Amino acid sequence: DDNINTLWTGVNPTTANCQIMASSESNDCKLILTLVKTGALVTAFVYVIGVSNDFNMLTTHKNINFTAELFFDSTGNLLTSLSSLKTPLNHKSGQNMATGALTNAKGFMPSTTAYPFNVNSREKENYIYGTCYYTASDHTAFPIDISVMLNQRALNNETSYCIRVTWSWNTGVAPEVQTSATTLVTSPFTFYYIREDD
Amino acid sequence: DDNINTLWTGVNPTTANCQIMASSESNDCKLILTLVKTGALVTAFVYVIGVSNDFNMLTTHKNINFTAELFFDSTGNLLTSLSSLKTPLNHKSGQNMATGALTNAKGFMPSTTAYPFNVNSREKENYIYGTCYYTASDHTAFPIDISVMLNQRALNNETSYCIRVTWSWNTGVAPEVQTSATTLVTSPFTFYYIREDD
Amino acid sequence: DDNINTLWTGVNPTTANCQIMASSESNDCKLILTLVKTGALVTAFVYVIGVSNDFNMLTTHKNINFTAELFFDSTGNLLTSLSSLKTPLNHKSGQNMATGALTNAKGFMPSTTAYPFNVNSREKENYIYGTCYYTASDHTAFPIDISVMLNQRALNNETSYCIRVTWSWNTGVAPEVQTSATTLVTSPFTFYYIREDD
């Protein structure tokens, strides 16, 4: 009440909390993720703020894709060692994460009834698509394709729920040139899914 | 009881609950519809999972359009004999519909103040548009146009509210060929409207 | 009382409540705006219904943009003298605005933690984009680009929070001709942002 209806990363973390590129090193961006319980659905709200030079310089290429993989255990806790996001989610505490135990965490998860694992005849049901935007140096909006796959494919036995968010573009010519590129920020993408029961 | 803040079809019903082709001899798809009260608005979340051969084979045509028509009486109850959806909505009970009386069903309906009946000067206000996606056998995303009309024209004196949802496409190439077609699934489309009062 | 979870214009005001075009005169349209508290986010739902002839005739041009500027003071109250919207927001009261004092009004505002003022290195984070639609005379849907900038740039000392919504299009040829143009109505655009704390 009402803070326990949100599970999130908090706002603008002081350091990179996410490793999106497998070639990184170490955390290479800030993943901002907010999940809000909305009746039978979750309202999910996600974007990235680039930190590493290699990540930011993706905007100099015409053909790119990168994926944040989020894996959760049987009670709705982020598995940080397996996931792109390396800091656990918690509830709302002002502009930050709370620090205690989670209330009803499993109820934030993508339902396995709506989004099954390993069922080929139903695999189309596991997908979400939309569009977000990169604000370019000339302040035009560069469209970025976003896809989300819910559950479908488990990494291993520990991972009871999965959210995989893939940003991509394939264009005639690129957001930015070497000297104009600054930070790869995506506009927030909001998507909805049927939630697992508490 | 947050369960009463949802009015929905339940998740993945056993059998087809919806007859969407007026060429069908019975229910031909699963209509998944979730309405959630969200302040002054309803958040509405809708897609189809095809069941009948003839419906699924629509994916082999390059030009298609089909519509789910939902009509409600003065107290917010689906009129199944009038509507594409042939099973009444009810509140959240886990992944399923509850089975009792409805609490404040009228409050899920599209406002007749925001979305009037038979006012030609305000007709433009009755329309919502967006895009959803079919996930093709080769895992590309095929864009489908979606339009919603709220109220505007009644079917008869019994219908106090209407939701009409039209999916359509017209491209050079069809989503599938005969040999690659399986099930016509649309990605969930979420739209918002100003809700009638309880 | 769920009514206090909404801050809005009410539905279809009797008279124009907004002056969008700087060449106007007086109020030239109805801004419909609904803000709903949704956990750590606000769900924002916005469109215009044109009233003045010059505003409605914008649809006869191929290259147009207009902006609703909404400025709020330090406790979340609309500054009507500074803003396009000239009538204060209030809570839900049926299809209308309530008339009493606001509960918690600052909590509807765009967070200055997520959406800072005057920080160049973070300016990309201040932007939201999407698409809405004008329903043309031939009942085709004409796409309109929408951008929202949150905070970023204060008008003056009074304006603690800013929401600026820009509608635009730049097309080969134009919604509408002099004799087909009627009312410029935009389909509702829903967007989300991280909210300031109560």
Please give, rounded to a whole number of angstroms, the shortest distance from the CA of C129 to a CA of chain A. Answer: 7
A185/C125 touch (CB, cutoff 8 Å), yes or no: yes
- Asked if residue B89 lies in contact with residue B198, where contact means CB atoms within 8 angstroms, the answer is no
- Asked if residue A53 lies in contact with residue A59, where contact means CB atoms within 8 angstroms, the answer is no
Q: Which value in Å is the resolution of this experimental model? A: 1.8
- Asked if residue B17 lies in contact with residue B173, where contact means CB atoms within 8 angstroms, the answer is no
Region for residue B71 given its phi and psi (left: phi exceeds 0; alpha: psi -120 to 50; beta: otherwise): beta
Length of chain C: 198
* CB-neighbour burial class of residue C182 (10 A; exposed 0-12, middle 13-18, buried 19+): middle
Instruction: Give me the long-range contacts of A138-142 (CB less than 8 A, separation at least 24).
Output: A141/A187, A141/C127, A141/C129, A141/C145, A141/C147, A142/A169, A142/A171, A142/A175
- Asked if residue C122 lies in contact with residue C112, where contact means CB atoms within 8 angstroms, the answer is no
DSSP string, B79-117: -TTTSSB-S--B-EETTEE--SPPSSGGGGSBPTTTS-B
- Asked if residue B44 lies in contact with residue B192, where contact means CB atoms within 8 angstroms, the answer is yes
- C-alpha B99/C-alpha B92 separation (Å) is 10
Q: Per the structure block, which two tokens stand in for B89?
A: 């909505």
Matching residue, tokens 């590309």: B140
CB atoms under 10 Å from CB of C116, counted, come to 18
Question: How does A126-145 read in b/e, with b if 16+ C-beta sit within 10 Å?
Answer: bbbbbbbbbbbeeeebbebe
What type of residue is A121?
S
- Asked if residue C142 lies in contact with residue C133, where contact means CB atoms within 8 angstroms, the answer is yes
Could you tell me where the DSSP H helices lie in chain A?
Answer: 53-56
What type of residue is A167?
W
Q: Where are the beta strands (DSSP E) in chain C?
A: 6-8, 29-38, 41-50, 63-72, 92-93, 96-97, 127-135, 141-150, 161-170, 189-194
Q: Measure the N-to-C terminal CA separation of chain B; round to a whole number of Å.
A: 16
- C-alpha A153/C-alpha C30 separation (Å) is 48
Angle at B159 between CA B156 and CA B161, to 5 degrees: 135
Please give, rounded to a whole number of angstroms, the shortest distance from the CA of A176 to a CA of chain C. Answer: 14
- C-alpha A78/C-alpha C150 separation (Å) is 31
B114/C11 touch (CB, cutoff 8 Å), yes or no: yes
Q: Rounded to an integer, what is the distance from CA B112 to the centroid of its chain?
A: 19
- Asked if residue A164 lies in contact with residue A127, where contact means CB atoms within 8 angstroms, the answer is no
For residue B72, what are the contacts with CB-CB under 8 A and spacing of at least 6? B78, B79, B109, B159, B160, B161, B162, B163
Could you tell me where the DSSP H helices lie in C61-145?
Answer: none
B134/A124 touch (CB, cutoff 8 Å), yes or no: yes
Please give, rounded to a whole number of angstroms, the shortest distance from the CA of C14 to a CA of chain A. Answer: 32
Please list every residue in chain A whose beta carbon sits closer than 8 Å to the beta carbon of residue B132: 129
Q: Rounded to an integer, what is the distance from CA B76 to the centroid of its chain?
A: 15
- C-alpha C37/C-alpha A50 separation (Å) is 28
Please give, rounded to a whole number of angstroms, the shortest distance from the CA of B97 to a CA of chain A. Answer: 11
Matching residue, tokens 């030079």: A53
B193/C190 touch (CB, cutoff 8 Å), yes or no: no
A63: Cα within 13 Å, side-chain hemisphere: 1
* CB-neighbour burial class of residue B189 (10 A; exposed 0-12, middle 13-18, buried 19+): buried
Angle at C116 between CA C112 and CA C119, to 5 degrees: 160
- C-alpha A43/C-alpha C114 separation (Å) is 18
B187/A113 touch (CB, cutoff 8 Å), yes or no: no
CB atoms under 10 Å from CB of C93, counted, come to 16
- C-alpha A71/C-alpha A77 separation (Å) is 8
- C-alpha A101/C-alpha A98 separation (Å) is 9
A40/B8 touch (CB, cutoff 8 Å), yes or no: yes
Question: What domains does chain A contain, in order, with CATH numbers?
Answer: 1-198 (2.60.90.10)
For residue B120, what are the contacts with CB-CB under 8 A and spacing of at least 6? none
β-pair partners for C147 = C129, C166
Q: Per the structure block, which two tokens stand in for B124?
A: 């433009």
β-pair partners for C41 = C38, C194
Instruction: Give me the long-range contacts of A20-29 (CB less than 8 A, separation at least 24).
Output: A20/A48, A20/A55, A20/A66, A20/A67, A20/A68, A20/A84, A21/A52, A21/A54, A21/A55, A21/A66, A23/A54, A24/A52, A24/A54, A24/A55, A25/A52, A27/A51, A27/A86, A28/A52, A28/A54, A28/A55, A29/A55, A29/A184
* CB-neighbour burial class of residue C131 (10 A; exposed 0-12, middle 13-18, buried 19+): middle
CB atoms under 10 Å from CB of C80, counted, come to 15
* CB-neighbour burial class of residue C100 (10 A; exposed 0-12, middle 13-18, buried 19+): exposed
Q: How far is CA A145 from CA A56, A69, C169, in A?
A: 17, 16, 21
- C-alpha B167/C-alpha B187 separation (Å) is 11
Instruction: Tell which of C31, C51, C97, C133 to mutate to test the B interface (max B CBs under 10 Å).
Output: C133
Please list every residue in chain B whose beta carbon sits closer than 8 Å to the beta carbon of residue A191: 190
- Relative to beta strand C161-170, strand C63-72 is antiparallel
Q: Measure the N-to-C terminal CA separation of chain C; round to a whole number of Å.
A: 16
What type of residue is A95?
Q
β-pair partners for B185 = B49
Q: Where are the beta strands (DSSP E) in A9-150?
A: 29-38, 41-50, 63-72, 92-93, 96-97, 127-135, 141-150
* Residue in C41, C113, C122 nearest the CB of A34: C41
- Asked if residue B176 lies in contact with residue B50, where contact means CB atoms within 8 angstroms, the answer is no
* CB-neighbour burial class of residue B115 (10 A; exposed 0-12, middle 13-18, buried 19+): buried
For residue C196, what are the contacts with CB-CB under 8 A and spacing of at least 6? C76, C106, C107, C108, C109, C110, C111, C112, C113, C161
CA-closest candidate to residue B95, choices B6, B158, B23, B162: B6
Chain B nearest-CA residue for C14: B113
